[PDB]
Amino acid sequence: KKMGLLVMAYGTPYKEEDIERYYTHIRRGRKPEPEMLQDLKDRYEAIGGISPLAQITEQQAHNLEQHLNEIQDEITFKAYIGLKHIEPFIEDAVAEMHKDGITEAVSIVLAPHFSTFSVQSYNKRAKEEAEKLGGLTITSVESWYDEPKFVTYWVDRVKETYASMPEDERENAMLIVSACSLPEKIKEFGDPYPDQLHESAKLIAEGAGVSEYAVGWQSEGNTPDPWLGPDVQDLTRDLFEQKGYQAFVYVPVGFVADHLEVLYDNDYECKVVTDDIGASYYRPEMPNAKPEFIDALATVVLKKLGR
Numbered sequence: 583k584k585m586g587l588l589v590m591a592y593g594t595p596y597k598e599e600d601i602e603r604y605y606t607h608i609r610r611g612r613k614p615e616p617e618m619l620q621d622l623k624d625r626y627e628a629i630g631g632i633s634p635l636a637q638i639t640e641q642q643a644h645n646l647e648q649h650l651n652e653i654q655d656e657i658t659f660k661a662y663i664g665l666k667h668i669e670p671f672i673e674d675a676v677a678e679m680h681k682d683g684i685t686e687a688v689s690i691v692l693a694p695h696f697s698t699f700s701v702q703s704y705n706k707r708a709k710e711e712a713e714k715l716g717g718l719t720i721t722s723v724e725s726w727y728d729e730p731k732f733v734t735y736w737v738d739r740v741k742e743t744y745a746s747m748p749e750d751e752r753e754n755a756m757l758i759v760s761a762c763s764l765p766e767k768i769k770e771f772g773d774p775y776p777d778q779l780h781e782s783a784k785l786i787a788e789g790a791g792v793s794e795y796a797v798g799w800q801s802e803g804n805t806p807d808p809w810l811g812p813d814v815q816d817l818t819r820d821l822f823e824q825k826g827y828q829a830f831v832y833v834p835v836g837f838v839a840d841h842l843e844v845l846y847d848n849d850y851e852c853k854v855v856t857d858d859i860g861a862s863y864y865r866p867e868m869p870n871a872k873p874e875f876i877d878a879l880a881t882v883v884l885k886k887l888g889r
């Protein structure tokens with residue numbers, strides 16, 4: 583049995599040549615002004631370049647198809663990447679599947695929390711393009727933050743981080759678990775996105791044994807509408823002022839890979855804030871394409887299919 587494996591993600595530019603069109607796409611067609619563009623470029627430079635980041639999704643999708651075809655023998659999976667904000671787009675991935683003769687696919691988004699703006703939008707764009715082309719069906723994973731193998735990944739890293747600490751810090755530490763902020767209007771549709779982030783943080787804090795943790799949001803866009811808050815920078819400060827913590831540990835659980843939203847908005851922006859206040863900054867390794875994470879994903883996909 584052959585099945586397409588449609589792996590979807592937000593996307594990151596493969597080359598600097600694409601930073602401009604990437605950002606224009608995110609800004610819903612509004613082209614960056616030259617100084618904004620330069621600012622962006624400088625950020626990617628500071629984190630060591632854009633090229634490494636794109637490759638991680640490629641390796642994630644490839645490892646997942648491989649481990650999927652390794653662990654069972656009734657389905658042969660073939661992976662297709664479809665990205666929201668850069669080529670190959672979701673629609674081009676479905677088009678390729680159809681060309682290769684695929685009639686049934688399973689899709690998964692590389693974002694463990696369901697939202698209307700992210701997961702649902704991707705799943706719908708995929709299904710609508712399958713329907714336009716005819717004779718291809720897609721069953722879509724909606725959320726997987728609660729998969730135990732995925733909780734275990736983050737719990738072990740948090741445990742290792744607290745274990746590595748000075749004794750002084752362990753007893754005066756704060757866990758901040760976060761994901762990408764979205765327009766506050768999502769709550770008009772009862773979007774469970776904020777609740778699922780709360781549940782993630784609890785699952786991970788409790789598995790790690792952590793009584794003190796908070797949920798924050800990051801990497802918000804600039805629009806006239808309110809976005810989900812508090813932002814991690816304001817939360818880190820409010821927390822250092824209701825209780826004066828000495829170490830802050832950041833688990834960007836909404837992100838699966840090293841990209842700008844982590845390497846910059848956490849390791850720079852939040853680290854600017856901890857350094858200032860002389861609390862310590864910790865941020866454990868992102869899952870990227872480590873075996874333990876890909877196994878969790880394979881399990882999510884098989885569970886979805888009824889195995």
Ligand SMILES: Cc1c2[nH]c(c1CCC(=O)O)/C=c1\[nH]/c(c(C)c1CCC(=O)O)=C\c1[nH]c(c(S(=O)(=O)O)c1C)/C=c1\[nH]/c(c(S(=O)(=O)O)c1C)=C\2
Nearest residue numbers: 608609610612699700762763764765801802803804805806
């Ligand atoms: C400048 C701009 C941005 N975003 C928009 C504008 C122009 C509209 C206006 O402000 O009047 C527009 C939208 N972004 C949206 C939505 C639903 C709109 C309205 C579209 C319309 O005009 O109908 C959603 C949205 N946006 C972003 C995401 S997320 O990454 O998935 O979280 C999502 C779901 C991301 C961003 N949007 C941004 C920026 S940035 O300030 O960094 O340049 C970012 C990082 C900026």
Ligand SMILES: [Mg+2]
Nearest residue numbers: 800801802847
């Ligand atoms: Mg920002």
